[PDB]
């Protein structure tokens, strides 16, 4: 497709990847890249820094605030107070001031905007950090963070319970436990009052707990996380670090019955002789429909239907697409139309898979269904590819050099036979090194590279109390953990339906 057929279609990011696909050939002249980044559906990362090769745009700086931007450091005491209020909103700029300019401006804003007094004069003494604190301004605590990580110090009861109520206080605390950066600002956040946290804060706040040996606060920052959390599947997390720390059997009772089928509910399920989930049967009679399954711009169309449709409307396109060969977008369509309620695990194009073992078949189908939902045509905001959602670097490396298929393209991952078969060959590499299907999938996701350096630490999928459990919640990257979890859960179900059944507590054995 050149950059005309394509400047004709709906923004997507479908077309973001043949854009991206004609940048990287260097097929898009000065001239076609004029009008180009209002044909760009995402803008950010590699295609950005591709169109910015060819026209390196400078904007922006809002226009009314223009002149502010042509004082520096020397000449601030010139500008006007909106200028000098404006400039003073980088915490850069207040370290580039020198020590009588922050003592000056200290003074002009000590009535209008204290929170830049403090900053003014915290960065007059040797640790701002120190001074914020005693100040106990959380704001400016928040943007020293954000400054800079290396700042660390303990912090009282009262400015523990402080931080909570600001926004960025949920990423700074994920990012400092997983991490396990910032000693002493983790050590501090046990005396966060549970009651003062929600959600995924709270269930951070009861790992932190564990790696202090602090059970009782744990349970209490789980219970509070289990209370509050949105979504079934993180209340079930919350409710097994429950159990598993204070043994109470009416946790594991609610955490065996739930709606949410994830690794805990199935846990929970077999450790009392609870039978199985049931899943759905997805036979539909009719064959075929008009749909091309192959065609990128197709899928991004209907995607964007099927997710703004009211009830009425998701079944009239539950109907059209209740056909073997559109199978994956029915399955996507119920799991909408039925509010996420019912067990959906298909089998499509299984003929491509059927000769493989059954374990090696579960994993594969248990990847897809976390990586595409099956859907042939599924690009990433990274532009991974297909069913096996492949990078196309990797696509191309077994592709062109090891498999050496006559006219290999990157766009073969959308087709199933491909995807399946690129998969089951990324899978054996990936397998032979890590063996457990949890490891394969963090590598799957990651890279075997942070697989590896994660599995070399000390203090991760080792002999403990609440191993491994513990070690599942301490994955470095937010996305790799989550994934694992999904993947796990995903693989137990399929290596159940295709009668090959094994006990979840065999496969959390094989961690350690
Ligand atoms: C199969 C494959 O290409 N795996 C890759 C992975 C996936 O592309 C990702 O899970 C799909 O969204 O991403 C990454 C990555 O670092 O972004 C690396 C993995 N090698």
Same mark, same amino acid.
């Given at each position: ?7 004709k ?18 097929? !898009? ?7 180009? &980044? ?18 390196? #745009? ?7 605030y ?6 520096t450091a ?8 909106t200028? =000098?209020?404006?400039?003073?909103? /980088? ?6 001031? @020198?020590?009588?300019?922050?003592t ?13 007094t403090?900053?003014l004069?915290? $960065? ?9 604190? =005693? ?7 928040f ?8 700042y660390?110090?303990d ?16 990423? %700074? ?76 059997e009416?946790d594991?009772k ?29 036979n539909?009679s009719?064959?075929?429909? @008009? %749909? ?12 964007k ?7 009425? =409307? ?9 056909? =073997? ?27 491509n ?23 042939p ?12 959602? %492949? ?15 006559p &006219? $290999? ?17 990324h899978?054996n590499?990936?397998? /032979? ?5 949890? %490891?394969?999938?963090?590598?799957? @996701? ?25 070690s ?24 159940? #339906? ?13 961690? !350690?």
């Amino acid at each position: 497709y050149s950059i005309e057929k394509l400047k004709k279609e709906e923004n997507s990011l479908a077309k973001d990847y043949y854009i991206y696909r004609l940048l990287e050939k260097n097929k !898009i002249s000065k001239k076609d890249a004029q009008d180009l &980044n209002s044909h760009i559906f995402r803008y950010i990362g590699k295609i950005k820094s591709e169109l910015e090769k060819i026209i390196p #745009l400078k904007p922006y700086i809002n226009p009314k605030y223009a002149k502010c931007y042509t004082y520096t450091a020397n000449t601030i005491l010139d500008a006007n107070l909106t200028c =000098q209020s404006v400039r003073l909103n /980088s915490l850069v700029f207040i370290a580039s001031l @020198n020590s009588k300019d922050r003592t000056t401006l200290a003074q002009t804003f000590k009535n209008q905007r204290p929170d830049l007094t403090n900053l003014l004069l915290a $960065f007059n003494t040797s640790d701002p950090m120190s001074y914020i604190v =005693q100040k106990e301004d959380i704001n400016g605590f928040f943007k020293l963070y954000n400054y800079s990580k290396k700042y660390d110090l303990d912090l009282n009861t009262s400015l523990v319970n402080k931080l909570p109520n600001h926004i960025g206080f949920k990423d %700074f605390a994920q990012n400092i436990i997983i991490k396990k950066e910032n000693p002493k600002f983790r050590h501090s956040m046990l005396e966060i009052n549970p009651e003062n946290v929600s959600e995924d804060s709270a269930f951070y706040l009861g790992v932190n707990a564990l790696t202090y040996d602090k059970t009782e606060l744990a349970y209490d920052f789980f219970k509070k996380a289990a209370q509050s959390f949105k979504s079934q599947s993180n209340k079930d997390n919350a409710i097994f670090w429950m159990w598993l720390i204070k043994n109470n059997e009416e946790d594991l009772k609610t955490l065996s019955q739930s709606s949410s089928l994830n690794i805990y509910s199935l846990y929970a399920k077999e450790l009392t002789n609870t039978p199985f989930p049931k899943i759905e049967s997805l036979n539909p009679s009719k064959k075929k429909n @008009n %749909f091309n399954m192959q065609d990128p711009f197709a899928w991004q169309k209907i995607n964007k239907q099927i997710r703004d449709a009211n009830a009425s =409307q998701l079944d009239v396109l539950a109907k059209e697409f209740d056909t =073997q060969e559109t199978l994956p977008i029915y399955a996507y369509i119920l799991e909408r139309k039925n509010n996420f309620k019912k067990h959906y695990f298909i089998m499509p194009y299984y003929d491509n898979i059927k000769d493989y073992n059954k374990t090696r078949q579960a994993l594969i189908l248990a990847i897809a269904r976390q990586e595409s939902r099956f859907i042939p045509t599924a690009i990433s905001v990274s532009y991974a590819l297909g069913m096996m959602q %492949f990078m196309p670097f990797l696509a191309n490396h077994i592709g062109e050099k090891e498999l050496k298929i006559p &006219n $290999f393209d990157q766009d073969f991952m959308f087709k199933p036979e491909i995807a399946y078969y690129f998969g089951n060959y990324h899978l054996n590499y990936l397998e /032979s090194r890590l063996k457990s299907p949890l %490891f394969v999938a963090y590598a799957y @996701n990651g890279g075997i590279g942070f697989t590896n350096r994660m599995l070399a630490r000390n203090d991760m999928f080792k002999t403990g109390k609440f191993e491994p459990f513990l070690s599942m919640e301490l994955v470095p990257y937010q996305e790799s953990r989550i994934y694992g979890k999904k993947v796990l859960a995903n693989y137990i179900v399929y290596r159940h #339906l295709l009668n090959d059944s094994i006990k979840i507590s065999d496969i959390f054995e094989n961690l !350690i």
